Structure formats: C-alpha cells, structure tokens
C-alpha cells in the first residue's frame, strides 16, 4: 500500500474538516462516522474536526462532534488540543463544552503552554475563571519560565486577583 | 503557544511509542493515559501506539491498548490503520483482536489499498479468511485498478477460490 514518503487525506476527510471549520452542520452530520470523526488534517498541522470547530466557535458542531466520539485529547503537531484553540480565540461556550466532556485543563503544548496561559494572555476573565474552577494551575511555567499570571495584561488587577 | 512551524512529541509520548513497539507492557501500563493512548509519532509517519503494537506483533500490548481507549480507526500519514499493519506483516492474532474491537475491514489507505489487498498480496490465507468473514470486499479496486484478487499469487487457486 501507501507506506513510504507519501502523505495526504481522502476527499471525504477533507470535506469533513472543511465543513467543521465552516460550521456546515449538515455536511458534518452526513460525513461524521466512527471512522472519520477524529481524522487529521495531514496537509496542515494535523488538526481534527474538533480543533477546527473549537477554533471557529462553531458551538453546535462542537456539540454534535462531542456527542459522536470526538476526542478532546487529540493533539495537533505542536501539542495543541481543541481546548487550547478555544481559549486562545476566546470562545467561552466552546471551552465550557469541552471541559464538561472531560478535557484536561492542565495539558501542555510543545512549549509547555496550558489553556490557562492562552486565556490569561488573551485576557478572557470568564474563561480563566472556568479553567481555575476545573483545576487549572496558575503557577505552571511554560518554556520561557512564564506562568499564566506572568502573561496577564500589564496592570490588569481584576484578572491578576482571580489568578492569585 | 506553539502555533506555527514547530512540531514534536513530548518525551513521555516518545517513551510510550517506543514501549509499544518493544512490547514493553510495564512501561505501556505506566504511560498509557487518556491523553496519551492515541498520541502520534510526529517525527515518524504519525503512527499511534496501536499501529506500533500491531506491526510488531505485540499481542498483549494490543490487548491492553484496545481495553484502554486506543483508536482502531486512527490513520497514519499515508492512510494506514493498525489493521493495515497487522495484515501487511501477517499477524493473525492481532488482526483478530482489532476486528473484535470494531476495526473496519473495508478501510482504504491513500492509494485505496484495503486490509484485504494487503493480506491477499502477502498470501495470508487465515487472515484473508478472517477479513472475509467480517465482510471484506474482494471487488474493491485500489488506485491501480487492482482488486485484492488481482494481487493474489499467480495461479494460487486456494486463495482465489477463498476470495471468490
């Protein structure tokens, strides 16, 4: 078979990833099966449909995917899980959905950045509070020696106090 | 976070992948978690621990992995699922375990080779038989226009009649 230097996706998997990114729920429902639900974007960075849905704030797609076997623990090539994407782009309802379905809050990417580092940097108070309530550690250092507290907007006392 | 051109595995994931390949059950039991069971070999071809266990005939490791959330539908960069590996290397006990746990036998890689294509080409009677008992299609053509029957050893009537 294809063993060797060759790489790529089928059109079906490509269509599902695109649909998940676009929020095209009808195509997602059509193409999502036990086989395809966690397909990887081989020509990109190996994001899954859940990565895309989480990253583009497609709440009903995220919901549908979680209900049909989507893996909240899938990591892209840089160590990012869908919760990283939700927190980095500031999508609260997405982040709440993933967490309630068992996403690990203290997961670290390739550079040791956790979802709390991302939500702190982006300055999303409610997401930070959600993460902390579900066990996120505001003292974890990334590769630069920065904790999420260190990444908080300069002088922002409300979010500093929340993370303290 | 790490978003961008960066890529790589954690040391712990690297160790779980190597443990699965070596048949090191005790290290597998130590490192296999919900976060790690389906990690992808980023420096390699994005195989999972289950690909590795299946390809190296690590029967007890396949079993443990399957019982702890390993994904039979996970595809590597070239479209290969762990079942492809079992059939390419003629591992019957492993192929049997995979199909008991929901593996799809008509799955196709990047070049549209199915597990039946592999077992037929490799000439594994019992594996062929097992795949057919679970619905494998001997009429499916790969990218070359070859069905699994087309790949069977020249004039090998026992395997031809099986596939018919």
């Amino acid at each position: 078979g294809a063993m060797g230097i060759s790489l790529g996706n089928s059109e079906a998997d490509r269509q599902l990833l695109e649909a998940a990114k676009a929020g095209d729920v009808e195509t997602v429902k059509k193409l999502c099966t036990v086989q395809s639900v966690n397909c990887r974007d081989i020509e990109g960075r190996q994001s899954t449909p859940l990565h895309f849905a989480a990253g583009y704030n497609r709440v009903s797609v995220v919901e549908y995917l979680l209900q049909h076997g989507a893996d909240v623990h899938a990591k892209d090539k840089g160590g990012l899980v869908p919760l990283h994407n939700a927190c980095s782009y500031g999508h609260y309802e997405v982040a709440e959905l993933l967490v309630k379905h068992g996403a690990v809050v203290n997961v670290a990417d390739l550079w040791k950045f956790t979802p709390l580092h991302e939500a702190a940097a982006k300055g999303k108070y409610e997401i930070c509070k959600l993460l902390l309530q579900h066990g996120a550690d505001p003292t974890k250092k990334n590769r630069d020696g920065n904790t999420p507290l260190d990444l908080v907007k300069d002088g922002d006392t409300d979010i500093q106090d929340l993370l303290r």
Side-chain angles (χ1 to χ4, degrees), chain A:
Chain A
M3 178 62 188
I5 65 178
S6 308
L7 84 174
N9 284 102
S10 72
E11 246 285 285
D13 287 348
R14 180 177 312 127
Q15 280 166 352
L16 176 56
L17 290 158
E18 265 297 332
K21 182 173 70 175
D24 174 4
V25 307
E26 178 181 346
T27 303
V28 171
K29 288 188 177 184
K30 181 166 65 95
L31 290 175
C32 184
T33 64
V34 76
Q35 298 180 257
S36 71
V37 57
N38 297 308
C39 64
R40 308 306 190 113
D41 182 19
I42 301 295
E43 71 277 41
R45 55 181 295 104
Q46 307 169 44
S47 302
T48 63
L50 193 53
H51 283 84
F52 284 108
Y56 288 75
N57 194 27
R58 312 295 189 197
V59 180
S60 63
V61 173
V62 166
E63 293 173 358
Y64 189 86
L65 289 177
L66 289 174
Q67 300 174 347
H68 294 70
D71 188 7
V72 292
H73 316 286
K75 279 176 172 277
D76 68 14
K77 76 180 178 136
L80 277 62
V81 300
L83 187 62
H84 277 113
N85 302 22
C87 297
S88 206
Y89 304 114
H91 306 323
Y92 176 90
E93 188 174 12
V94 170
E96 190 177 36
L97 279 163
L98 297 171
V99 167
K100 294 309 189 192
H101 282 79
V104 179
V105 293
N106 289 314
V107 58
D109 69 12
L110 189 71
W111 294 349
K112 303 306 187 184
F113 277 71
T114 67
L116 195 58
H117 285 95
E118 302 298 334
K122 301 286 172 143
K124 302 308 283 197
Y125 186 101
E126 287 306 319
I127 293 185
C128 282
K129 176 177 182 187
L130 171 76
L131 292 173
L132 293 161
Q133 279 182 349
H134 285 81
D137 187 346
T139 76
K140 293 222 292 176
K141 290 172 169 175
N142 60 23
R143 64 163 189 173
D144 305 303
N146 285 321
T147 76
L149 187 56
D150 288 317
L151 298 184
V152 162
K153 176 187 287 184
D154 192 13
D156 195 344
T157 49
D158 283 16
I159 184 160
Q160 284 171 329
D161 293 338
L162 169 77
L163 265 74
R164 237 88 102 131

